Amino acid sequence: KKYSIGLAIGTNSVGWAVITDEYKVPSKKFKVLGNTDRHSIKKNLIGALLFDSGETAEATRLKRTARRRYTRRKNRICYLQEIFSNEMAKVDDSFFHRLEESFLVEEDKKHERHPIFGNIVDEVAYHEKYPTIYHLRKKLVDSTDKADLRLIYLALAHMIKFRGHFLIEGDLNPDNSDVDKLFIQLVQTYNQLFEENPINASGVDAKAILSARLSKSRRLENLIAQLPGEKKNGLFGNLIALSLGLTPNFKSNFDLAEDAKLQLSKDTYDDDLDNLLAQIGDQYADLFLAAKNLSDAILLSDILRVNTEITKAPLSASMIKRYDEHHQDLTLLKALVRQQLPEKYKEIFFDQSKNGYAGYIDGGASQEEFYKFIKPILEKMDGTEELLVKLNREDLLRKQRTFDNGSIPHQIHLGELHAILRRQEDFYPFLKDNREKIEKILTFRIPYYVGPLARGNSRFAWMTRKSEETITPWNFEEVVDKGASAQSFIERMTNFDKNLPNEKVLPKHSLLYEYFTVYNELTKVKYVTEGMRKPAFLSGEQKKAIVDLLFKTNRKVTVKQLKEDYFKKIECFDSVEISGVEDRFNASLGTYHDLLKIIKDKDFLDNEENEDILEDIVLTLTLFEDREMIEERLKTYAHLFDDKVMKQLKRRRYTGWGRLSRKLINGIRDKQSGKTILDFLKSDGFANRNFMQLIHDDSLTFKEDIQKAQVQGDSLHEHIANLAGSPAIKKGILQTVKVVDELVKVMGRHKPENIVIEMARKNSRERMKRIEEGIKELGSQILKEHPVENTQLQNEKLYLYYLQNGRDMYVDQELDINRLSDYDVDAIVPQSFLKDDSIDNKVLTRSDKNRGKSDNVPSEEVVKKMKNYWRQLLNAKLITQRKFDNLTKAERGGLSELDKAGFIKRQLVETRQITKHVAQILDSRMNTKYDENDKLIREVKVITLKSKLVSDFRKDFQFYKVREINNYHHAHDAYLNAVVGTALIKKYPKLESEFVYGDKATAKYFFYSNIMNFFKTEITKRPLIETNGETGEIVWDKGRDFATVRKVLSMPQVNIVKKTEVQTGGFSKESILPKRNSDKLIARKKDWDPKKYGGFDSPTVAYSVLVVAKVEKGKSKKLKSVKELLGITIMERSSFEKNPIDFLEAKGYKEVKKDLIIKLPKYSLFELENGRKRMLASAGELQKGNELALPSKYVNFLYLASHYEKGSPEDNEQKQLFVEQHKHYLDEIIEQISEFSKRVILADANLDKVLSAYNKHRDKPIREQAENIIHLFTLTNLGAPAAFKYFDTTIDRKRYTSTKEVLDATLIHQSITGLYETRIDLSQLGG
RNA sequence: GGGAAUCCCUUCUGCAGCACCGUUUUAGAGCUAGAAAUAGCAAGUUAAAAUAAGGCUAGUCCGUUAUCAACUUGAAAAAGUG
DNA sequence: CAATACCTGGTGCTGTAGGAGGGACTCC
DNA sequence: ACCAGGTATTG
Ligand SMILES: [K+]
Ligand SMILES: [K+]
Ligand SMILES: [K+]
Ligand SMILES: [K+]
Ligand SMILES: [K+]
Ligand SMILES: [K+]
Ligand SMILES: [K+]
Ligand SMILES: [K+]
Ligand SMILES: [K+]
Ligand SMILES: [K+]
Ligand SMILES: [K+]
Ligand SMILES: [K+]
Ligand SMILES: [K+]
Ligand SMILES: [Mg+2]
Ligand SMILES: [Mg+2]
């Protein structure tokens, strides 16, 4: 018995089919287990497994790290209280106890209900004096009086609990605070550098202009408008824009060639400045430095909006300013509404449901919603002008704890904390002794390279300790081995050398590694001149001279430099032809030039004796990112360099690692030559072997040593998990393997001939970030003129409009937003060649005509017109490098014939790595024996197809698919994959190279474009029967095999199986609901009675459990027999599984039939009467469990009538005539749907509404009626009910809110294919 | 066909370290006329604590990913069954 | 019990290795 | 937004 397997691997489905020699699908009698009167069943060997999407680990990780941070914040507060313990016990022996129980109701409080002072008078007095904590913070910073220890604790604890971010290294307030002073010093530096062209900055209020609550460009324009002979794009204007955070281009200021685009926010600025300082000189370093200082001052003025000379707590002072202006404006606004619009005062200030002030303070109205609600009210009244100004500044009636407080750096809270400590250590000795301890509590962070401070019970931890003792913020440097931990952080993530698996890979920017790369590329260069008979390699001396003259004097070596600065200067060649390199060398000695600029000792870099040292330095610069640790490591070489050079070395850092180890590059030596790999790269006679040739040459010992150096096997699941790909497709892959195992077991452990596999093919925030970055880097204002919300960017044309800066991409013209529907979206490379519909291959233009010819890439004229605009869009990252290269390919010859042939080959031949991994897995599982030559015996051919093959097959032979009808199309795709792949390799066996796993352009283009014509009877004529040319074996009978495919697709019995899964994840909805009298509320803590404290509800059921027992009834507690479904929640699952009987008895059940406990996961299948099926959605809800096997004729009619996806106009007219001749299929389809719904769905109201809706639109165009009949199948689809629209009529979902019936129905346990069943009559349970 | 180093992009998987809000109960004396229901007015911006219940291994650790038909063994892991 | 209608934790930042899609270039 | 299961209100 010979057979093949077809597979369709998706993210939510694995379709499977078994075919025979004649492309038929077998059917078998399968034994049925259980307690029913059915002993066996007929099954077709075709089906599809369905499953919920596999989830990434991201949400779990975010929750885990948030858990850690909550624990550590609690620990900070605990450290502070431990410091305060004894003296607070002297002052108030229950203060911390009152703080701990602040959440409890007075009933459950063991102490007085007023936390700070324990009596109502003192508490009310405190609140009257300090309405916000920031009042107390400012007072404890400024005052000289001894203060109550409890208020000191409250201030310090508030600073420590909410300490602020750590984006800024070093200390703050370094006299970079005043904006006036830094603006004036910038003017000083500018006038020093440009004596002849000075700026009169007198009378310019730099403070108010630069610190204003406005956009960067607006403040730039404001400051420039106060400078007459100055424009915003001049040098001083560019410096001010740099200080404001924009992206100025200093090219035009200095008449440069290199585009000196500078942004202080980017990571490259430090080099971007230095690079710029190369051309203009070092005299301008002070200018850009003053600009950087001014930028710091403006950033601080964003947060501190108060004069810093009246208080040492400007942050708390700014919060108090918020409070005071809120109070004044609230009084004024209340008076306004009292006098003018009194009929609205109650709604504004009493209705929490409304987004007024009441809903803003007491309800759920945010600052934005409150502004939106009150802006028209302020506009409607008189005297609200300053209020509307404050509102449009987003600075009206502000709270202190707000979303934007994320700006506040931790150093400001630290300054306030340090000031309070300095004030109050004069009166409390323990504050003086523990000042730095508290400061350290605030400042200390666990470094990212250290990880969790575990002690052997964390699978995530890598930290190593110097000494075995409890880690605290104060003993961290002594207990934690930061060096070993930071090294393990990297070395656990980095690959070893694959050639030498025990050797660590070199740093990417290692000098030796770059030498290796440069020589490896330079060895394959060839050159010709006039007198030369044949192109020649570069000799060792030639390569060394090129390295010394060009690679060690320029960061990049171009081909022009090679021709002129070497072949002309040294070899005296006026003309030379170069091969092996184009435009410029890819490899370069970048680290060499970095270190040459830093240390300024070329002889030091060139001396081989220092090699090791330099390597180690680069290692330190690559392995570590903490500047203190880098300094500590470089300290061993302090004697070799000046302190200035040592500082500059500290600041330089590298990221990334190579692919080869030092021992491979320059360690192992060929036995006879005694030469390393790099030695051969530098000089190898006239053979000039590169790395690949060197390690594969049988006349050298490199290959032998590599084989010798090679060295536990993964499980199937482990191997699949370690694949690179989405976890969803990995779930699909493992399910595919299990399906194949079961199918082989079905066929009596006989392995198939072939296995044909095909693998299927927030974000608006990403788009808005893309466009913001591109426009601000571009310097455009299209966002000013056209505000847009991230959701709108999901329209393709508008997103393209913004990525193109509102311009045509083929014509140097502006485009109109309001006319986007009149424009075109065009593919850069035509979709007839590259089926690419991403934004990467798409372009918004006024007319696609202006592209040029439609058979190729945009013409040369358009490229010459628009290359500059495209390069600007590329530098703004609004288009990618690939998009730019495809747009500009016409200047490089456009599309060659080889390119089109390759595009069609790509359309047909699968090349994704993950599909190859699936093929390898199946192949290594199926083929395990070796022959006489010890070569693998490939009994099973693993073929991989792309979806376009079977899609075109369906569209060419009218085997159409409609995904909304049911789930049968996955199984049908698997069947068609099996058939098409088997026939394709039977017809052309040589194609086994391309399609089977294991080891002229016009001609190939023609061949691949017409590879599937042997199925056709006439082309653009061919025999009916199609055979193999050499074997003479028949591969396709066009008179009988298409009928076989049609009959297979018409079979109504298809094994659709929904994978039953225990639910995991969160216990319930995260919302912390207010108190409520309901047993649904769940306590957030053991003693927090939800009736008093609120809590959660809506828990997730891990799985239900069938319980057959007795429950007490009535006041008499009489035992009554019951059979019911109990949903074990995810939170209850461990307790239930530890002891099921005790768990159930705690719920109330008595005399539980232990052996009759059935574990029912989600989607458990039950059959009732008339084949009606239900799936377990929960313990108290059901899902639809049946498939609607709509006959093939109705499916094809619906495909054709709805214009689902053309062909010849004669064929189009024939299909149209078929539709119009079979219009009665509409009523027939509605009849099929109605019979199915009355038998199985059981939604009387929805079915009647649907019948009325269909009878209402019977005069509608056939296209529309068919398109909405497509929607109608949501009523009948398998799974959870959902709402659907028939035209404008909306049908809400009918839900099955009871599970009582399945307790007496037939439970069906299905194998992974559903061919093996166990049926349990549940009516025989309970009595 | 498969594979490797380098260059330019683009993207995704795993991990660690942090910040800001939100919510929840309590605290921040509401007043006056009424017996009351209620009416009129005042007021509001802040804090504490929790942020998966919790666990033992007690760490400044772990607690939401992956994996799961039934049945027979078997504590499990596992093998087997049509 | 049925029809119905609501509801559903969110944002921002730093560091890091690896695989893999597209295009070059040299090779096994 | 999604889905789609939990929940209270209504009857
Ligand atoms: K009490
Ligand atoms: K001006
Ligand atoms: K609010
Ligand atoms: K490693
Ligand atoms: K190049
Ligand atoms: K580094
Ligand atoms: K020195
Ligand atoms: K799971
Ligand atoms: K899930
Ligand atoms: K209150
Ligand atoms: K199953
Ligand atoms: K990442
Ligand atoms: K990457
Ligand atoms: Mg906790
Ligand atoms: Mg808060």
mmCIF file with all atom_site columns, N, CA and C in Angstrom, chain A residues 38 41 120 160 185 230 282 299 308-309 346 379 490 552 575 581 598 692 977 991 1004 1049 1081 1092 1096 1187 1221 1257:
data_model
loop_
_atom_site.group_PDB
_atom_site.id
_atom_site.type_symbol
_atom_site.label_atom_id
_atom_site.label_alt_id
_atom_site.label_comp_id
_atom_site.label_asym_id
_atom_site.label_entity_id
_atom_site.label_seq_id
_atom_site.pdbx_PDB_ins_code
_atom_site.Cartn_x
_atom_site.Cartn_y
_atom_site.Cartn_z
_atom_site.occupancy
_atom_site.B_iso_or_equiv
_atom_site.pdbx_formal_charge
_atom_site.auth_seq_id
_atom_site.auth_comp_id
_atom_site.auth_asym_id
_atom_site.auth_atom_id
_atom_site.pdbx_PDB_model_num
ATOM 1  N N  . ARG A 1 38   ? -21.943 2.394  19.549  1.00 0.00 ? 38   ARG A N  1
ATOM 2  C CA . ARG A 1 38   ? -21.130 2.460  18.343  1.00 0.00 ? 38   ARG A CA 1
ATOM 3  C C  . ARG A 1 38   ? -19.744 1.885  18.610  1.00 0.00 ? 38   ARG A C  1
ATOM 4  N N  . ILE A 1 41   ? -16.321 3.428  13.149  1.00 0.00 ? 41   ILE A N  1
ATOM 5  C CA . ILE A 1 41   ? -16.826 4.540  12.349  1.00 0.00 ? 41   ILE A CA 1
ATOM 6  C C  . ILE A 1 41   ? -15.986 4.661  11.087  1.00 0.00 ? 41   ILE A C  1
ATOM 7  N N  . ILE A 1 120  ? -7.200  63.389 65.453  1.00 0.00 ? 120  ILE A N  1
ATOM 8  C CA . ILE A 1 120  ? -7.826  64.090 64.338  1.00 0.00 ? 120  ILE A CA 1
ATOM 9  C C  . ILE A 1 120  ? -7.360  65.542 64.267  1.00 0.00 ? 120  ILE A C  1
ATOM 10 N N  . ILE A 1 160  ? 12.005  58.426 47.927  1.00 0.00 ? 160  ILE A N  1
ATOM 11 C CA . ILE A 1 160  ? 12.614  57.136 47.611  1.00 0.00 ? 160  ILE A CA 1
ATOM 12 C C  . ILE A 1 160  ? 11.643  56.234 46.851  1.00 0.00 ? 160  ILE A C  1
ATOM 13 N N  . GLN A 1 185  ? 26.429  82.806 27.161  1.00 0.00 ? 185  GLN A N  1
ATOM 14 C CA . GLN A 1 185  ? 27.748  82.232 26.903  1.00 0.00 ? 185  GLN A CA 1
ATOM 15 C C  . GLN A 1 185  ? 27.858  81.692 25.479  1.00 0.00 ? 185  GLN A C  1
ATOM 16 N N  . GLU A 1 230  ? 19.650  87.852 11.441  1.00 0.00 ? 230  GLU A N  1
ATOM 17 C CA . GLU A 1 230  ? 19.865  86.427 11.637  1.00 0.00 ? 230  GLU A CA 1
ATOM 18 C C  . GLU A 1 230  ? 18.658  85.649 11.136  1.00 0.00 ? 230  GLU A C  1
ATOM 19 N N  . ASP A 1 282  ? 39.185  72.461 15.486  1.00 0.00 ? 282  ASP A N  1
ATOM 20 C CA . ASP A 1 282  ? 38.899  72.347 16.909  1.00 0.00 ? 282  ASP A CA 1
ATOM 21 C C  . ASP A 1 282  ? 38.478  73.666 17.544  1.00 0.00 ? 282  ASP A C  1
ATOM 22 N N  . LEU A 1 299  ? 16.248  71.675 28.865  1.00 0.00 ? 299  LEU A N  1
ATOM 23 C CA . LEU A 1 299  ? 15.618  70.445 29.331  1.00 0.00 ? 299  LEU A CA 1
ATOM 24 C C  . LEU A 1 299  ? 15.261  70.536 30.809  1.00 0.00 ? 299  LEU A C  1
ATOM 25 N N  . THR A 1 308  ? 15.391  79.345 40.866  1.00 0.00 ? 308  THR A N  1
ATOM 26 C CA . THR A 1 308  ? 16.171  78.466 41.729  1.00 0.00 ? 308  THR A CA 1
ATOM 27 C C  . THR A 1 308  ? 16.971  79.217 42.787  1.00 0.00 ? 308  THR A C  1
ATOM 28 N N  . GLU A 1 309  ? 16.786  80.528 42.914  1.00 0.00 ? 309  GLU A N  1
ATOM 29 C CA . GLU A 1 309  ? 17.511  81.318 43.898  1.00 0.00 ? 309  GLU A CA 1
ATOM 30 C C  . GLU A 1 309  ? 16.662  81.682 45.108  1.00 0.00 ? 309  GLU A C  1
ATOM 31 N N  . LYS A 1 346  ? -23.917 72.455 38.637  1.00 0.00 ? 346  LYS A N  1
ATOM 32 C CA . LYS A 1 346  ? -24.057 71.140 39.253  1.00 0.00 ? 346  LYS A CA 1
ATOM 33 C C  . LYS A 1 346  ? -23.455 70.053 38.371  1.00 0.00 ? 346  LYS A C  1
ATOM 34 N N  . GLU A 1 379  ? -14.819 78.844 26.106  1.00 0.00 ? 379  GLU A N  1
ATOM 35 C CA . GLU A 1 379  ? -14.992 79.680 24.920  1.00 0.00 ? 379  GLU A CA 1
ATOM 36 C C  . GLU A 1 379  ? -16.342 80.388 24.922  1.00 0.00 ? 379  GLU A C  1
ATOM 37 N N  . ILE A 1 490  ? 27.283  38.683 28.912  1.00 0.00 ? 490  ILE A N  1
ATOM 38 C CA . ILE A 1 490  ? 27.560  38.644 27.481  1.00 0.00 ? 490  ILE A CA 1
ATOM 39 C C  . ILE A 1 490  ? 27.877  37.224 27.026  1.00 0.00 ? 490  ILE A C  1
ATOM 40 N N  . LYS A 1 552  ? 45.598  52.181 6.010   1.00 0.00 ? 552  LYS A N  1
ATOM 41 C CA . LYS A 1 552  ? 46.060  52.778 7.255   1.00 0.00 ? 552  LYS A CA 1
ATOM 42 C C  . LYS A 1 552  ? 46.155  54.295 7.181   1.00 0.00 ? 552  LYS A C  1
ATOM 43 N N  . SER A 1 575  ? 46.495  53.360 -16.638 1.00 0.00 ? 575  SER A N  1
ATOM 44 C CA . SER A 1 575  ? 45.206  52.701 -16.799 1.00 0.00 ? 575  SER A CA 1
ATOM 45 C C  . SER A 1 575  ? 45.312  51.289 -16.248 1.00 0.00 ? 575  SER A C  1
ATOM 46 N N  . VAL A 1 581  ? 36.338  43.899 -6.452  1.00 0.00 ? 581  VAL A N  1
ATOM 47 C CA . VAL A 1 581  ? 35.862  44.986 -5.607  1.00 0.00 ? 581  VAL A CA 1
ATOM 48 C C  . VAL A 1 581  ? 35.181  46.003 -6.510  1.00 0.00 ? 581  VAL A C  1
ATOM 49 N N  . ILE A 1 598  ? 42.776  58.533 18.980  1.00 0.00 ? 598  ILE A N  1
ATOM 50 C CA . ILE A 1 598  ? 42.754  58.622 20.439  1.00 0.00 ? 598  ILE A CA 1
ATOM 51 C C  . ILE A 1 598  ? 44.168  58.687 21.014  1.00 0.00 ? 598  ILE A C  1
ATOM 52 N N  . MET A 1 692  ? 37.744  30.541 2.980   1.00 0.00 ? 692  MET A N  1
ATOM 53 C CA . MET A 1 692  ? 37.026  29.327 2.602   1.00 0.00 ? 692  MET A CA 1
ATOM 54 C C  . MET A 1 692  ? 37.954  28.320 1.937   1.00 0.00 ? 692  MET A C  1
ATOM 55 N N  . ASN A 1 977  ? -1.919  20.217 -2.124  1.00 0.00 ? 977  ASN A N  1
ATOM 56 C CA . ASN A 1 977  ? -0.463  20.225 -2.037  1.00 0.00 ? 977  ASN A CA 1
ATOM 57 C C  . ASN A 1 977  ? 0.101   18.845 -2.337  1.00 0.00 ? 977  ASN A C  1
ATOM 58 N N  . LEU A 1 991  ? 13.674  18.151 -11.290 1.00 0.00 ? 991  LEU A N  1
ATOM 59 C CA . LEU A 1 991  ? 13.263  19.152 -10.315 1.00 0.00 ? 991  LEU A CA 1
ATOM 60 C C  . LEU A 1 991  ? 13.401  18.680 -8.877  1.00 0.00 ? 991  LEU A C  1
ATOM 61 N N  . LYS A 1 1004 ? 15.309  29.681 -18.876 1.00 0.00 ? 1004 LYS A N  1
ATOM 62 C CA . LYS A 1 1004 ? 14.846  29.382 -17.526 1.00 0.00 ? 1004 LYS A CA 1
ATOM 63 C C  . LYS A 1 1004 ? 13.576  30.151 -17.198 1.00 0.00 ? 1004 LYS A C  1
ATOM 64 N N  . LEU A 1 1049 ? -12.750 16.984 -3.053  1.00 0.00 ? 1049 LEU A N  1
ATOM 65 C CA . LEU A 1 1049 ? -13.173 18.264 -2.497  1.00 0.00 ? 1049 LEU A CA 1
ATOM 66 C C  . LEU A 1 1049 ? -14.660 18.296 -2.167  1.00 0.00 ? 1049 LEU A C  1
ATOM 67 N N  . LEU A 1 1081 ? -16.676 38.720 43.521  1.00 0.00 ? 1081 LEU A N  1
ATOM 68 C CA . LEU A 1 1081 ? -15.462 39.442 43.869  1.00 0.00 ? 1081 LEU A CA 1
ATOM 69 C C  . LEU A 1 1081 ? -14.466 38.520 44.559  1.00 0.00 ? 1081 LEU A C  1
ATOM 70 N N  . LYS A 1 1092 ? -15.732 44.745 51.749  1.00 0.00 ? 1092 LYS A N  1
ATOM 71 C CA . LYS A 1 1092 ? -15.195 45.954 52.358  1.00 0.00 ? 1092 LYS A CA 1
ATOM 72 C C  . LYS A 1 1092 ? -14.133 46.637 51.509  1.00 0.00 ? 1092 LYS A C  1
ATOM 73 N N  . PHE A 1 1096 ? -10.970 41.674 42.532  1.00 0.00 ? 1096 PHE A N  1
ATOM 74 C CA . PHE A 1 1096 ? -11.119 41.212 41.162  1.00 0.00 ? 1096 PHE A CA 1
ATOM 75 C C  . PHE A 1 1096 ? -12.446 40.490 40.969  1.00 0.00 ? 1096 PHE A C  1
ATOM 76 N N  . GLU A 1 1187 ? -19.585 21.710 11.613  1.00 0.00 ? 1187 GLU A N  1
ATOM 77 C CA . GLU A 1 1187 ? -19.143 22.325 10.370  1.00 0.00 ? 1187 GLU A CA 1
ATOM 78 C C  . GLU A 1 1187 ? -20.267 22.245 9.347   1.00 0.00 ? 1187 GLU A C  1
ATOM 79 N N  . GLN A 1 1221 ? -27.205 32.034 -15.008 1.00 0.00 ? 1221 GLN A N  1
ATOM 80 C CA . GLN A 1 1221 ? -27.990 30.824 -15.216 1.00 0.00 ? 1221 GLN A CA 1
ATOM 81 C C  . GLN A 1 1221 ? -28.241 30.052 -13.932 1.00 0.00 ? 1221 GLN A C  1
ATOM 82 N N  . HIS A 1 1257 ? -33.398 42.224 0.540   1.00 0.00 ? 1257 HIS A N  1
ATOM 83 C CA . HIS A 1 1257 ? -32.447 42.700 -0.458  1.00 0.00 ? 1257 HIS A CA 1
ATOM 84 C C  . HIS A 1 1257 ? -32.407 41.813 -1.701  1.00 0.00 ? 1257 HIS A C  1
#
